[PDB]
């Protein structure tokens, strides 16, 4: 965890903790979702978020919960560092079959089935290994941009 | 002689990167220049070889060899006459005003005789040549003899 | 020591000296660490901080201890001054090999091994000598931002 990433989680903690007392309760979760447009947010969704913690969601409990789910989270500059080492001549997005062979043949984390899931929402270019950069974006901030 | 100038020994401790009080033979040319001596690089080369000293293989030094080599180079400072430096550049460009066109002095200083890198040539023209492309060598040789 | 840097150390001395009597004892160290989230701060860490002083930690003993550890500490504006002289055309971060050659060939403090340690937590850009500015930040305030 770099310090600017921890400051981003402190700002997200303050936007969900609308009572500003330092502990995100279930009313803060529901009022942050209602301010984003969720008028139908069920109480069972709020209870499942609180069921991931053993205590009240203060800043260090929110940081430890996000730490334990993001144990391989990598910032965009280090993902582009590794993709610039995979394309060491610069500019070009690397081939689809080169990333499939190098993921498998180096590591067990790069096994195929997982490579079909990589191509599956990370579209073609991304999946193929040709573009580059959009995948670093969606690994640090999810969903389609 | 001491006049025993013990600051030459203190400057040898500023150029020795290992702190063992030895200075390699490849640094001796530039450190003679930093002590106030301008021997040409062929002269520094000859003297070395003259004494069956090879600058091609690893070298170390001791203060006891560097002191007499600086004292053998110190007699040759009578060759530094500024009349001939300004008259050299006055024969290098026409008309009665001391201006070399930029690229004439840069290509002559890099390729004629003892090769000066173009990085060092740009660092010696930086400030004395303005955007007219004309180097006034009356002030240029004055500032080169200020160091 | 510029006067605003000494006022920053006076404010840090007042935040660690929670008894406000002018001398930081071991209870102040432990209660400042517990207020930052350190519930497991051992007494041996507090004793090692007090073992760096010959007397009680008043404001002038804290300033002399920080002075003797920060004998080459440089503010961010003077580090950016020197990096603007290394990049005199402005804007561009300077090359990796240019900073390695100029550190070594000018001074003994710029020797290589030390240059590998500079690249080692000061990441690539920083290490390389291309970016600039993030290194001035982390030299005045440590750890990843």
Swiss-Prot record, chains A, C:
GO biological-process terms attached to the record: muscle contraction; skeletal muscle tissue development
GO molecular function, one term: calcium ion binding
Domain EF-hand intervals: 9-39, 74-109, 110-144
Binding-site positions, Ca(2+): 17, 19, 21, 28
PTM per Swiss-Prot/TrEMBL: The N-terminus is blocked. N,N,N-trimethylalanine, found in other myosin light chains would not have been detected in the N-terminal tryptic peptide in PubMed:7358336 because it would remain trimethylated and ninhydrin negative after hydrolysis.
Function summary: Myosin regulatory subunit that plays an essential to maintain muscle integrity during early development. Plays a role in muscle contraction.
Note: This chain binds calcium.
Name this polypeptide is given: Myosin regulatory light chain 11
Parent sequence residues shown: 29 to 164 of 168
UniProtKB/Swiss-Prot annotation, chain B:
PANTHER family tied to this protein: MYOSIN LIGHT CHAIN 1, 3, MYOSIN LIGHT CHAIN 1_3, SKELETAL MUSCLE ISOFORM
Chain ranges of the EF-hand domain: 7-38, 41-76, 80-115, 115-147
This protein's name: Myosin light chain 3, skeletal muscle isoform
Keyword Repeat attached: yes
Species the sequence originates in: Gallus gallus
SMART domains: EFh
Annotated TM spans: none
Domain of life: Eukaryota
GO cellular component: contractile muscle fiber; myosin II complex
Subunit structure: Myosin is a hexamer of 2 heavy chains and 4 light chains.
PTM: The N-terminus is blocked.
Molecular function GO labels: calcium ion binding
Keywords: Motor protein, Muscle protein, Myosin, Repeat
């Amino acid at each position: 965890f770099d310090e600017t990433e921890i400051e981003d989680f402190k700002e997200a903690f303050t936007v969900i903790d609308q009572n500003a007392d330092g502990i995100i309760d279930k009313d803060d979760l529901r009022e942050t979702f209602a301010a984003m447009g969720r008028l139908n947010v069920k109480n069972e969704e709020l209870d499942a978020m609180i069921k991931e913690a053993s205590g009240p969601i203060n800043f260090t409990v929110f940081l430890t919960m996000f730490g334990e789910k993001l144990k391989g989270a990598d910032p965009e500059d280090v993902i582009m560092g590794a993709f610039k080492v995979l394309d060491p001549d610069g500019k070009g997005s690397i081939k689809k079959s080169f990333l499939e062979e190098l993921l498998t043949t180096g590591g067990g984390r790069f096994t195929p089935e997982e490579i079909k899931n990589m191509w599956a929402a990370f579209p073609p270019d991304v999946a193929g290994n040709v573009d580059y950069k959009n995948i670093c974006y969606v690994i640090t901030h999810g969903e389609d941009a | 002689s001491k006049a025993a100038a013990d600051d030459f020994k203190e400057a040898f401790l500023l150029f020795d990167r290992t702190g063992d009080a030895k200075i390699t033979a490849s640094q001796v040319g530039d450190i003679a220049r930093a002590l106030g001596q301008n021997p040409t690089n062929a002269e520094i080369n000859k003297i070395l070889g003259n004494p069956s000293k090879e600058e091609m293989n690893a070298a170390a030094i001791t203060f006891e060899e560097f002191l007499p080599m600086l004292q053998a180079a110190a007699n040759n400072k009578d060759q530094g006459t500024f009349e001939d430096f300004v008259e050299g550049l006055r024969v290098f460009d026409k008309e009665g005003n001391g201006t070399v066109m930029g690229a004439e002095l840069r290509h002559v200083l890099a390729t004629l005789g003892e090769k000066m890198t173009e990085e060092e040539v740009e660092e010696l023209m930086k400030g004395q040549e303005d955007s007219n492309g004309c180097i006034n060598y009356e002030a240029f040789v004055k500032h080169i003899m200020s160091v």
